[PDB]
C-alpha cells in the first residue's frame, strides 16, 4: 500500500528485462494501473511521486507537509531543470520488443509500505480433516485445519440455482451424515439396534 | 481585526497516524482515514532492540528507508529513524493486464 489508501496485492512479477524501460535504462520496481486514480481522486499520490522524483534527483528531502505553499507548479518547474519532462512523464520502451510505447508513462519514486497480510498465512484447503466434538462438523480455523463455512446465504444462492443435489451433498456427505434408526410407531430415535 | 490568538501550526490538528500522509490536503477525506488505519499494519522496525525481546509475532523489514517526501511532523515521530517502507520506483501503466 502506498500512503494514500491504495492497497494492492502483487498480481505477477516480471523480471527486469521484461519490464518497460526508459531511455536511461531505468525499470520500474512496481507498476500500478491508471484506473486506480480517477475515482479515488487521490491526487496526493501523484504529487508525492512528482516531489520525490525531484528530491531524488536533487538530493534533498521533499517537504510534503500539509498546509504549506508548495505547489505543483513549483515542483513542476524544478523537475524541468533537472532535464525531465515537467509533469513526470517519460518515454518508455516496451520490454518485449524494445519498441517505443505510444503513450508516455508517469514515472518516479513513491513510498510504499508492505502490509501484514501475507498470502501464505491465508491459503487453506481441506478434504476430510477432524471434526468438532459436540456437533461433529469440521472444526474451524486455518490454524487447526478447519473447514470453510457454507453459510446461510450460500445456501440461498444454491437454491436460486436450483441445484438440489449439490445442496444436499454439501450439507450431508461433505459435513456430517449420520445413520440412525427410528421406531416406526413413536418416531423417536430410541431404537436399540444391535446391528451386529 | 480582533484576533486574540494564533494557531501554532495548522497542521497540528492531525494525530500521529495522519501525520505521515504526505499532502493530506490534496486527498479525498476517507482516503486519509484508510491510510491512517493501514499504516498501523505496515511493517518496519518497531524498536531498536527487537533482538532481545521475545514477543510473539514480530516483523522487521530488511532495508527500511526514510521517505523521500516527508512531513515536518514526521520529525517528532522518529519516523525517519524507524521508517516503515521503501521508496519503490513506480510506473502508472497498463502494461500487461496483470
Amino acid at each position: 500500500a502506498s500512503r494514500h489508501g491504495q492497497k494492492g496485492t502483487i498480481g505477477i512479477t516480471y523480471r527486469r528485462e521484461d519490464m518497460p524501460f526508459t531511455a536511461e535504462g531505468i525499470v520500474p520496481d512496481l507498476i500500478i494501473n491508471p484506473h486506480a486514480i480517477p475515482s479515488r481522486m487521490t491526487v496526493a499520490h501523484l504529487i508525492e511521486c512528482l516531489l520525490s522524483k525531484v528530491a531524488a534527483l536533487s538530493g534533498n528531502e521533499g517537504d510534503a507537509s500539509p498546509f504549506t505553499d508548495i505547489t505543483v507548479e513549483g515542483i513542476s518547474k524544478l523537475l524541468r531543470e533537472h532535464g525531465y519532462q515537467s509533469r513526470g512523464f517519460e518515454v518508455m520502451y516496451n520490454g518485449h520488443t524494445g519498441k517505443k510505447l505510444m503513450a508516455q508513462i508517469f514515472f518516479g519514486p513513491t513510498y510504499y509500505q508492505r502490509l501484514r497480510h501475507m498470502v501464505d498465512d491465508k491459503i487453506h484447503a481441506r478434504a476430510r480433516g477432524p471434526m468438532q466434538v459436540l456437533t461433529r462438523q469440521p472444526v474451524e480455523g486455518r490454524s487447526r485445519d478447519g473447514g470453510l463455512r457454507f453459510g446461510e446465504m450460500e445456501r440461498d444462492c444454491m437454491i436460486a440455482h436450483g441445484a438440489a443435489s449439490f445442496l444436499k451433498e454439501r450439507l450431508m456427505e461433505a459435513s456430517d451424515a449420520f445413520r440412525v434408526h427410528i421406531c416406526g410407531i413413536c418416531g423417536l430415535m430410541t431404537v436399540i439396534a444391535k446391528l451386529n | 481585526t480582533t484576533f486574540t490568538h494564533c494557531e501554532i501550526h495548522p497542521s497540528m490538528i492531525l494525530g500521529v497516524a495522519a501525520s505521515i500522509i504526505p499532502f493530506p490536503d490534496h486527498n479525498q477525506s476517507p482516503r486519509n482515514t484508510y491510510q491512517s488505519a493501514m499504516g498501523k499494519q505496515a511493517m518496519g522496525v518497531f524498536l531498536t532492540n527487537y533482538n532481545v525481546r521475545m514477543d510473539t509475532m514480530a516483523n522487521i523489514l530488511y532495508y527500511p528507508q526514510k521517505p523521500l517526501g516527508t512531513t515536518r511532523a514526521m520529525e517528532y515521530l522518529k519516523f525517519r529513524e524507524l521508517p516503515a517502507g521503501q521508496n519503490a520506483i513506480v510506473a502508472i501503466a497498463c502494461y500487461s493486464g496483470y
Binding site: 536533487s58 517537504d63 513549483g74 | -
Partner: peptide, 15 residues
C-alpha cells in the same frame, strides 16, 4: 520546496 536540515549550520555560525 524541500526540507532543509542544514540550517543548523547558519544557526550555529550566526550565534
Amino acid at each position: 520546496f524541500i526540507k532543509r536540515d542544514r540550517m543548523r549550520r547558519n544557526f550555529l555560525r550566526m550565534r
